[PDB]
Design an enzyme around this catalytic site. Structure first.
Site, short mmCIF file in Angstrom:
data_model
loop_
_atom_site.label_atom_id
_atom_site.label_comp_id
_atom_site.label_asym_id
_atom_site.label_seq_id
_atom_site.Cartn_x
_atom_site.Cartn_y
_atom_site.Cartn_z
N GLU A 1 48.61 33.35 91.96
CA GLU A 1 48.16 33.71 93.31
C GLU A 1 48.41 35.16 93.61
O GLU A 1 49.53 35.65 93.44
CB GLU A 1 48.83 32.86 94.39
N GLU B 1 55.96 29.51 95.66
CA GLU B 1 56.84 30.53 96.29
C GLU B 1 58.14 29.96 96.85
O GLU B 1 58.43 30.03 98.06
CB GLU B 1 56.07 31.27 97.38
#
Ligand SMILES: N[C@@H](Cc1c[nH]c[nH+]1)C(=O)O
Length: 391
Positions: free
Chosen positions: A230, A141
């Site tokens: 994820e 991320e």
């Protein structure tokens, strides 16, 4: 009349399935126990049949040994392992102001080479401990790094273009929190960066179905894998993992990943958590049984095939083919409060019998009566608010 139709086309091959699984993080939370490792990565009765383990690359190499027991065991049980870093070692990081917010972290531009060496060191350490990583990521991320290390699209591009070819492993990038294409487009549009990419990794937090297709990846991504590495859905509410019919959102998100996104892998966040596929007591949650409808049956190397995805309102169908014998696994979700009957045409198949396993709010992967085909058509009935895997 009251009957919808679907067609599975076994000749229209889509993506090869790499697998399903979740995260272990033995620094932030407790490691999986031996019993829990078997439950996660074994595919016996009452086991999840996961085939992908995701782990983190600790900024502190003294923590690396904590990953080994679980990763070895996953591999022994037939899984592959990918590793993602949240921060570089602190001696490689600097601060900057982002969108008016001060004290944000990024990798120093003069430390990109040292960062490659850090990642390569992790790869080598795990290999020495019997963990041959399938892939390693540039950054978890990079575009939602309020609490970790930010990379802009161009920073990620510079690393992928100028450095990532030195990584001694498959390279995964960019693991956007929401599969935001601005993080990955520059990689795909630069031939050297694209050459150094092996796996396009994406997370699914807030990713709507209209944002699951990726035309640029379809155009330029030949030979690259596509993994959803994820998510938790629809929330991380404490003690939520048995909520019903909420858990049906898990199945629906997986169906969407596979059919709307062409994803080859779907990886949850923490495997063992009160909102995860395994509860803190080591047993499988309703969310876990949603995952298991895919993971236990759609094994690595199966190939998704074209199939009527939404045959009637609230019903969602995916199909994958085992190329060894041209058998098919179909996962069908009925989110309706009404029962649904589907005539599923499978032209050209020599299969004449399906077994089926059904989960509702009151049973988990319960084996129900076999479906016998009339010719190449399998007429199935789906209980209200259920998921069924046909095999
Ligand atoms: N699962 C992320 C947190 C997150 C929620 N939404 C986006 N990111 C993490 O723990 O690293």
């Amino acid at each position: 009349s009251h009957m919808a139709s679907a067609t599975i086309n076994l000749s229209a091959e889509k993506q090869v399935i790499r697998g399903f699984g979740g995260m272990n993080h033995p620094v932030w939370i407790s490691d999986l126990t031996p019993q829990q490792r078997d439950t996660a990565f074994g595919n016996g009765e009452g086991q999840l049949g996961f085939t992908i383990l995701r782990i983190h690359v600790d900024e502190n190499r003294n923590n690396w040994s904590k990953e080994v027991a679980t990763a070895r065991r996953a591999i022994e049980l037939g899984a592959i392992v990918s590793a993602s870093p949240w921060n570089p070692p602190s001696n490689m990081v600097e601060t900057f102001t982002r969108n008016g917010v001060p004290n944000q972290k990024r990798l120093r531009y003069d430390k990109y080479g040292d960062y490659v060496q850090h990642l390569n060191d992790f790869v080598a350490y795990m290999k020495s401990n019997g963990v041959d990583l399938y892939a390693i990521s540039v950054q978890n991320e990079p575009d939602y790094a309020h609490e970790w290390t930010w990379w802009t699209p161009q920073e990620m591009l510079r690393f992928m273009r100028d450095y990532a070819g030195q990584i001694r492993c498959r390279v995964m990038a960019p693991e956007s929190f929401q599969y935001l294409k601005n993080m990955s487009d520059p990689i795909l549009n630069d031939p050297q960066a694209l050459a150094n990419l092996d796996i396009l990794g994406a997370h699914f937090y807030g990713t709507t179905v209209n944002n699951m297709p990726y035309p640029l990846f379809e155009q330029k991504g030949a030979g690259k894998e596509l993994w959803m590495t994820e998510v938790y859905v629809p929330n991380s509410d404490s003690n939520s993992a048995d909520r019903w019919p909420e858990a049906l959102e898990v199945a629906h998100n997986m169906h969407n990943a596979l059919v709307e996104g062409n994803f080859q892998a779907y990886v949850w966040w923490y495997i063992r958590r009160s909102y995860g596929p395994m509860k803190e007591d080591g047993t499988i949650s309703k969310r876990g049984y949603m995952m298991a409808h895919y993971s236990k049956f759609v094994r690595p190397g199966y190939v998704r095939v074209d199939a009527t995805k939404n045959p009637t309102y609230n019903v969602y169908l995916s199909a994958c083919k085992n190329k060894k014998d041209n058998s098919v696994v179909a996962v069908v979700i009925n989110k309706s409060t009404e029962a649904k009957t589907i005539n599923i045409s499978v032209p050209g198949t020599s299969i004449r019998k399906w077994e089926r396993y059904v989960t509702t709010g009151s049973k988990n992967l319960r084996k129900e009566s076999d479906i016998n085909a009339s010719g190449t058509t399998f007429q199935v009935t789906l209980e209200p608010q259920s998921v069924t895997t046909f095999v």
